[PDB]
RNA sequence: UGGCCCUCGAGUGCAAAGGCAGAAGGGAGCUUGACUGCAAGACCCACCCGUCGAGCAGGGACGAAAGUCGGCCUUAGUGA
RNA sequence: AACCCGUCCUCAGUUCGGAUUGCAGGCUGCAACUCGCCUGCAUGAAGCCGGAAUCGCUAGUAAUCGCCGGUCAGCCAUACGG
């Protein structure tokens, strides 16, 4: 555990190395940086307090546990309510309008 | 699960299907308390105590003193002098019972200390 | 800040608390803990050596004493294993171990686990002892194990009243 | 033939000894496995002729 | 305890929080590092209710609109 | 792996019967008595075979010692 | 746009790859659930140049880069024609 409960690598970049956070993303991560206004060094090379001040403010975003609750919970929403993007969840299928005559490999595989 | 009496009681009766005293070389057993020694002398053929020495007798309890509980210089003096109220009755052969404890320890002080003099075993 | 907290917590604020919660006529009715197994089996242990040789290892570490090859008590083919071959991997915790141990658990391991809400209350085995599941080892900062909390509690809620003032966040 | 029978000869005893108190050789002979015991098996042992127990070792 | 068969444990092993003591254990390694210690995590300071049912909806309704 | 309850329902290399629970079952440490020279007295019984065995000397193992050991819990594993 | 200059990424399912899904919004329109196109975030599948087989191309061609238009309120166009 680096930060955020997981353990990132050492050696990448910081910008780059913060996405392995399942609720970092590649634009956050570039808000986090430039509200702190520090120089992206490496990750072993970075001092204490300042990643002392990243490891506050990293924690005001959904970054995990609820994030993935409040998914789950999303659809799970739609199933019990039996929408029909809920059923499409349910039977394994897609529910933006996709064609399933001769696609939709992902979901068919993910069985 | 078993307890400390419970498992120190199945330890002598293990022991006490060999040993057997007799006219001509009775049973010495030792009971050792949290506070207090103890010993017989026994001929089962007659179930009958010849001799004894406790911690509770006036010739040694003047002598030690202890606090917690009888160290090891203490059963050197309870095998000292069974050993001189089992001379005066006029028998030396005896077999030693450890009551089901080790012999390492306390025990083994206390039949050298017999065995130093007087008695055969 | 103190040398050891839950051995000085427990004689001094705990006692005098969990008697006048169930109101015992005597100090030594009070449930204790005894000890703190902690198991790890591997099915695929007389396969190697160096992933046995190692793991346990990694517990030793995790709780400063050796574990012990636990070996099978009847041989059966279904699971394709053998009489007297080593299955587990056990080690018994007592004294100021399981509470060094114990420290080590709630604060350190346990919510370093993803996605954790509390661990199940209902765990209990109907006799005031308590059983917990890992998957994982590396929350203690140094596969999976399975411990087991012993206490001399008769039901099981002073149980669960005697662990929750430990820690031992239940939801 | 995994099993056979040892033959076990007295290390010490010499051959035509001119001694006054018994002259010979001691020599048992006991049971053995060979896959289960490659080796040779020698045994401390009694020895009419020595007057001691002494180590007899196998012969072949 | 026997003797060359034990980690070197020990008690009293400091525990830092970026160089915040905020209490010592027994361990076998030196020090340690934490950030999940008792209170940066919220379950233990929340209820511990381990349960939310995402209220309503019709609050996504009406205050939006306004 | 932890605990609770019933208690001999398991196991004892193999067939069965009989026996064995702080055990004859299950482990650990040291060991070769799986000896030499005998043997009072018994069981069995057409004959030839077969079985148990106190105790004595010798030189030894284990045990602190008392004491135990002349192959295996017993009965088939053999040929004048 | 490819391209030139400069910083970083150094062979990794990766700063390759962008499928799938949730949340929050916009435009067209009487109407966007089945069934439109887009934005902002967060998720980050398979896939390491590909069997037996098989297609195109003989010069500004193949390969590769992007631009426009028609139908059209809008657009499922990665198409069609340039
Ligand atoms: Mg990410
Ligand atoms: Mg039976
Ligand atoms: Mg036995
Ligand atoms: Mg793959
Ligand atoms: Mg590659
Ligand atoms: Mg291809
Ligand atoms: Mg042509
Ligand atoms: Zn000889």
């Known amino acids: 555990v680096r930060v955020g409960n997981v353990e990132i690598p050492n050696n990448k970049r910081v910008e780059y190395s913060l996405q392995y956070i399942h609720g970092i993303g590649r634009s956050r991560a570039r808000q986090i940086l430039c509200d702190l206004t520090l120089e992206n060094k490496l990750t072993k090379e970075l001092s204490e307090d300042e990643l002392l001040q990243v490891r506050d403010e990293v924690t005001k975003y959904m970054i995990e546990g609820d994030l993935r609750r409040f ?3 999303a659809i799970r929403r739609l ?5 029909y993007r ?12 996709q ?3 001769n696609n939709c490999r992902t979901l068919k595989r993910g069985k | 699960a078993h307890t400390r009496r419970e498992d120190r009681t199945a330890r002598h009766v293990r022991i006490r299907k060999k040993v057997e005293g007799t006219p001509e070389r009775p049973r010495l057993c030792v009971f050792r308390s949290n506070k207090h020694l103890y010993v017989q002398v026994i001929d089962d053929t007659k179930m009958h105590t010849l001799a004894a020495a406790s911690t509770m007798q006036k010739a040694i309890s003047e002598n030690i003193d202890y606090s917690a509980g009888p160290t090891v210089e203490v059963a050197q003096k309870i095998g000292e002098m069974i050993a001189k109220s089992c001379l005066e009755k006029g028998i030396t052969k005896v077999a030693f019972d450890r009551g089901g404890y080790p012999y390492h ?12 003099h007087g008695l055969v075993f | 800040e103190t040398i050891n907290r839950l051995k000085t917590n427990y004689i ?3 006692v005098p608390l969990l008697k006048e919660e169930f109101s015992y006529s005597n100090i030594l009715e009070v449930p204790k803990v005894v000890k703190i197994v902690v198991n790890c089996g591997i099915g695929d242990a007389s396969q190697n050596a160096k992933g046995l040789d190692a793991a346990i290892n990694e517990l030793a570490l995790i709780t400063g004493q050796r574990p012990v090859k636990t070996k099978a008590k009847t041989s059966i083919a279904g699971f394709k294993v053998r009489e007297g071959m080593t299955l587990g991997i056990a080690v018994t915790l007592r004294g100021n171990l399981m509470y060094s141990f114990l420290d080590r658990l709630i604060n350190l391991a346990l919510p370093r686990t993803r996605d954790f809400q509390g661990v199940n209350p209902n765990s209990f085995d109907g006799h005031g002892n308590y059983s917990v599941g890992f998957r994982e080892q590396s929350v203690f900062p140094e596969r999976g194990m399975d411990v087991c909390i012993t206490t001399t509690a008769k039901t099981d809620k002073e149980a669960y009243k005697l662990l929750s003032l430990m820690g031992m966040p239940f939801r | 033939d995994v099993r056979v029978k040892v033959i076990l000869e007295c290390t010490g005893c010499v051959r035509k000894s001119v001694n006054k108190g018994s002259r010979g050789v001691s020599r048992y002979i006991t049971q053995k496995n060979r896959h289960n015991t490659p080796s040779r098996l020698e045994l401390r042992k009694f020895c009419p002729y020595c007057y001691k127990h002494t180590i007899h070792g196998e012969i072949k | 305890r026997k003797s060359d068969i034990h980690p070197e444990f020990r008690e009293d092993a400091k525990v830092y929080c970026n160089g915040e003591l905020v209490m010592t254990t027994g361990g ?4 340690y590092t934490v950030e999940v210690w008792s209170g940066n995590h919220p379950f233990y300071l929340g ?6 049912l995402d209220a309503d909806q019709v609050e996504k309704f009406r205050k939006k609109y306004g």
Do not use: Y
Request: some cysteine; hydrophobic content about 35%; overall charge positive.
């Open chain 1, 71 to 73: 998914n789950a919970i």
């Open chain 1, 79 to 83: 199933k019990e309510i039996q929408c």
């Open chain 3, 12 to 14: 001094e604020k705990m």
């Open chain 5, 47 to 52: 209820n511990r209710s381990a349960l939310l």
């Open chain 2, 105 to 116: 320890g306390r025990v083994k002080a206390l039949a050298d200390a017999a065995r130093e």
């Open chain 1, 99 to 101: 064609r399933t005559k």
């Open chain 1, 86 to 97: 809920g059923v499409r969840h349910i039977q394994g299928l897609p529910c933006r309008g």
């Open chain 5, 28 to 31: 076998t390694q030196k020090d």
